[PDB]
């Protein structure tokens, strides 16, 4: 029994990982119709930031050699025309590098042995020209997607293992995986947006959480645990810079457990050492990126290290509130002083977009950039419909019941006011997971799209219902406990099958015929080195296909993109036309591409259209003729005499418009 249980746990974890992989693949094939799409049409299916990421993978796989492809992407001069940038550490393009490094030898070795990894067939679309659709592992798109989905499949396994760890039973893991599967749409979006950074990084973040829970539960230590924690932290840090903030919320969780005498000294040392080593390795592998410093993650590392290493000097303290308050003050003071003392003190860059978005929601801070962020609904408050969906499947009620039970047991089992510095109070992993859930819930409620973190932790905390100690021990017998636990599963199936049925009976649309004509015209009527400017979603696809150099791009986290974007988007302002022409000449752009729906009044949500956004950023030019009116008039009357410096070179069916800067 002691060995049959563990083998069964591991096998079920692998099985649920495979099932999740198959499910996400089916959803992706239903949504995007890649089975009957040409290669350039798949690039079109990769929209605003997905296209910018995939273009570097395509660049490396088409380079004469892997090293020259890396040298070309680390000395890039076509993403931001005017200077040279290193996109490998700026955009976190390590997954692309790894996938290309694996793809090139694979096709090279398959070709030598004549293995037919790719099969191509003609697809007749209709009035448009027929194209060729190639399906197989040899196709670069399918190789990339298979890598993404193989990585993303392990999230179900990690959730199963976390459910087993916090409940000591397979029933907890089953509850966690069932809650994850019935709320799959509200938990992840990798099926609809593969090339996003979170698709690569979140599995490693949740794996790191699982390993940390295992280490805390069994009080492990040594170099092996450090290696295990680092092998998850480093890949998660090299991908998705936002990972840093996530690892901040983990640290704040660990501290709150450690201050309650639930984490021994040696394992705390092991955890903090693993974090230090992982941060150093990531900082060195990201070419000394200053924005990694002066984040919230490094000062937190230093603060928690100092808190841990001064813990034995305070072992004589008996009043628990004083101990906890003193530790919290030291932690907060160190992290705040180090963050302020390096960003404002020395000007070591920093990415304060999170703080600015949060300031605009509570205060009256408006800004142009925060207005771009908070009018898209994936950076606004969470919607009530999502809460209704989560309560309908009985995920939130289960989590609330489990949290109440844990709080009651913790209160009844722990001496609140007096501490003994030599006794470990047990159940530290559960408290760490509960505090992490609270942090993730606050994050997701403030900014929607941070649900990626909240929903799996709700599934994990729901598994506390299967913990025997929390819910009566031997007072609820064993036959009753199993009887009630299968009842919960039966009720969950009754309210989860409709959700998965709905999620499987949704078929997407894949026409987008206008952008294909626009890109065809770009490829035929413009030269290879023509510089293009416009809205960022259009620019990322203009770079991905037609390979033309661009000025601005949708990657907005770093610095020196906001000024370029603010200068490019002046074509929608009320500035004099000569001034915007001079601005375009100074940036060196040749063509400007936009849509006629970008210059449309809304009157339902003003000041989320560019017409109303520019009045706050440029009050003095209010009362002038808006540039959008001139663009619409020129596109309609077909004679571009009033816009003398500019000239409309592309105008088809009044959707996409391309102006030439003379």
């Amino acid at each position: 029994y002691s060995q049959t249980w563990l083998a069964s746990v591991v096998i079920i974890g692998l099985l649920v990982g495979y099932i999740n992989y198959q499910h996400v693949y089916t959803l992706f094939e239903n949504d995007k119709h890649f089975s009957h799409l040409a290669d350039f049409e798949r690039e079109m299916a990769y929209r605003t930031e997905m296209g910018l990421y995939y273009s570097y993978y395509k660049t490396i796989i088409n380079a004469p050699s892997f090293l020259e492809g890396v040298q070309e992407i680390t000395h890039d001069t076509v993403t931001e025309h005017g200077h040279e940038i290193n996109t490998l550490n700026r955009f976190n393009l390590y997954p692309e590098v790894i996938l290309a490094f694996l793809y090139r030898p694979f096709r090279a070795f398959a070709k030598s042995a004549n293995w037919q990894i790719e099969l191509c067939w003609q697809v007749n679309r209709g009035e448009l020209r027929p194209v060729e659709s190639c399906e197989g592992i040899g196709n670069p798109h399918y190789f990339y997607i298979t890598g993404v989905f193989i990585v993303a499949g392990t999230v179900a396994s990690s959730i199963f293992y976390l459910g087993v760890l916090v409940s000591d039973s397979i029933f907890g893991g089953f509850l966690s995986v069932l809650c994850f599967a019935f709320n799959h749409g509200e938990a992840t979006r990798v099926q609809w947006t593969p090339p996003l950074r979170e698709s690569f990084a979140f599995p490693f973040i949740i794996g790191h959480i699982a390993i940390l829970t295992f280490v805390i539960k069994y009080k492990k230590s040594g170099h092996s645990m450090i290696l295990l924690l680092t092998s998850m932290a480093v890949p998660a840090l090299l991908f998705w810079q936002f990972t840093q903030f996530a690892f901040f919320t983990q640290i704040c969780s660990i501290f709150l457990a450690f201050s309650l005498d639930l984490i021994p000294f040696s394992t705390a040392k092991t955890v903090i050492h693993s974090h230090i080593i992982s941060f150093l390795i990531g900082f060195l592998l990201l070419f000394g990126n200053e924005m990694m410093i002066t984040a919230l993650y490094f000062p937190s590392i230093l603060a928690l290290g100092m808190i841990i290493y001064i813990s034995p000097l305070l072992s004589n303290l008996k009043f628990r509130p004083a101990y906890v308050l003193f530790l919290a003050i030291i932690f907060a003071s160190i992290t705040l002083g180090l963050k302020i003392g390096l960003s404002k003190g020395l000007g070591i860059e920093d990415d304060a977009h999170i703080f600015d978005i949060l300031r605009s929601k509570f205060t009256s801070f408006a800004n142009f950039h925060t207005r771009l962020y908070t009018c898209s609904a994936e950076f606004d408050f969470i919607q009530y419909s999502t809460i209704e969906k989560l309560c309908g499947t009985l995920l939130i009620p289960l989590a609330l019941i489990s949290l109440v039970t844990f709080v009651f047991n913790f209160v009844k089992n722990t001496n609140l006011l007096w501490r003994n510095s030599e006794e470990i109070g047990e159940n530290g992993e559960i408290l760490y997971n509960v505090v992490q859930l609270c942090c993730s819930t606050v994050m997701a409620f403030l900014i929607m799209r941070l649900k990626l973190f909240m929903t799996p932790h709700l599934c994990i905390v729901a598994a506390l219902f299967a913990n025997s100690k929390l819910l009566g021990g031997d007072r609820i017998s064993k036959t009753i406990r199993v009887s009630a636990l299968v009842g919960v599963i039966a009720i969950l199936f009754y309210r989860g099958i409709p959700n998965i049925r709905q999620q499987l009976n949704v078929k997407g649309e894949y026409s987008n015929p206008d952008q294909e004509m626009l890109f065809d015209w770009i490829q035929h009527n413009t030269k290879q080195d023509a510089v293009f400017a416009g809205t960022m979603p259009v620019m990322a696809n203009v770079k991905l296909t037609t390979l033309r150099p661009i000025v601005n791009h949708p990657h907005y986290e770093h610095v020196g993109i906001r000024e370029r974007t603010l200068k490019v988007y002046s074509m929608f302002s009320k500035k004099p036309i000569a001034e915007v022409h001079k601005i375009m000449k100074e940036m060196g752009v040749n063509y400007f591409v936009f849509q006629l729906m970008n210059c449309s009044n809304d009157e339902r949500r003003p000041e989320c259209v560019y017409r109303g956004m520019w009045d706050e950023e440029d009050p003095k030019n209010s009362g002038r003729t808006a540039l959008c009116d001139l663009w619409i008039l020129a596109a309609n009357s077909k004679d571009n005499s009033r816009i003398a410096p500019f000239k409309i070179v592309y105008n088809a069916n009044r959707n996409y418009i391309v102006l030439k800067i003379l």
């Epitope: 303290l317 008996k318 009043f319 004083a322 001496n415 006011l417 007096w418 003994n420 510095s421 006794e423």
Partner: antibody
Framework: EVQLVESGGGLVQPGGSLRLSCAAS????????IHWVRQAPGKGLEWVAS????????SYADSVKGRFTISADTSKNTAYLQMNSLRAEDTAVYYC??????????????????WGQGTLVTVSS | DIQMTQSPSSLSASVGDRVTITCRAS??????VAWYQQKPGKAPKLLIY???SLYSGVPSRFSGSRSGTDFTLTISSLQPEDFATYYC?????????FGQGTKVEIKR
């Protein structure tokens, strides 16, 4: 000098209510915590209850939690202890001792330095 | 919920003899232990606090020693006056628990 005086002991019938007081001379209240210690005949010292009047903390022993009540005022520098539903083994001599305040516990309570003379109370039928 | 156990419940020694009384704590109270002396029919008085500090007023003959979670109060020279009951107290938890109480006698 600093001293503790207690009054209210004597004879009472079991199951009734008693209401005694402990006053202090010298130090002002709310600067320190005060505890009640009982001693039964032929038995040792048993801690009963404690109160810090600085911000209003009261604590009781498990064996007597649910009957005892302490209220301390700051104007007249004294505390008032009330018992109800006395048992047959609650007879004892009570002492009103002084120690450091709970809010400044900080490595624990200080030892009882200034004790009270104690009042003897008996329950009889 | 903490037990203050004294093994020498009854101790008989002559005048001038060195006497030692031990005190064992179930938990790990660091230095929150105090010693009290109570005369028959009187109120207890503080002798030793923090297991190593001598109260101002008690003669310096009294000594307190600590080893782990074990504590001891010793008197080098026994005299007529230090004939009373001795109590051991802990102060690291809200339920304050006293020792069992040891009685000193006159060997004759």
């Amino acid at each position: 000098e600093v001293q503790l005086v207690e009054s209210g002991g004597g004879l009472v019938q079991p199951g009734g209510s008693l209401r005694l007081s402990c006053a202090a001379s010298g130090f002002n209240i709310s600067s320190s915590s005060i505890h009640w210690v009982r001693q039964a005949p032929g038995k040792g010292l048993e801690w009963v209850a404690s109160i810090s009047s600085s911000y209003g903390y009261t604590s009781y022993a498990d064996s007597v939690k649910g009957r005892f009540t302490i209220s301390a005022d700051t104007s007249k520098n004294t505390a008032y202890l009330q018992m109800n539903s006395l048992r047959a083994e609650d007879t004892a001599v009570y002492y009103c001792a002084r120690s450091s305040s709970v809010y400044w516990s900080w490595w624990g309570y200080s030892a009882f330095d200034y004790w009270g003379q104690g009042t003897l109370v008996t329950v009889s039928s | 919920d903490i037990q203050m156990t004294q093994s020498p419940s009854s101790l008989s020694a002559s005048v001038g003899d060195r006497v030692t009384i031990t005190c064992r704590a179930s938990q790990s109270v660091s230095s929150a232990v105090a010693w009290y002396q109570q005369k028959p029919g009187k109120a207890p008085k503080l002798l030793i606090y923090s297991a190593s500090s001598l109260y101002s007023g008690v003669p310096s003959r009294f000594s307190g020693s600590r080893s782990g979670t074990d504590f001891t109060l010793t008197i080098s020279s026994l005299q007529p006056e230090d004939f009373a009951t001795y109590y051991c107290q802990q102060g690291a938890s809200e339920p304050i628990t006293f020792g069992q109480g040891t009685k000193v006698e006159i060997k004759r």
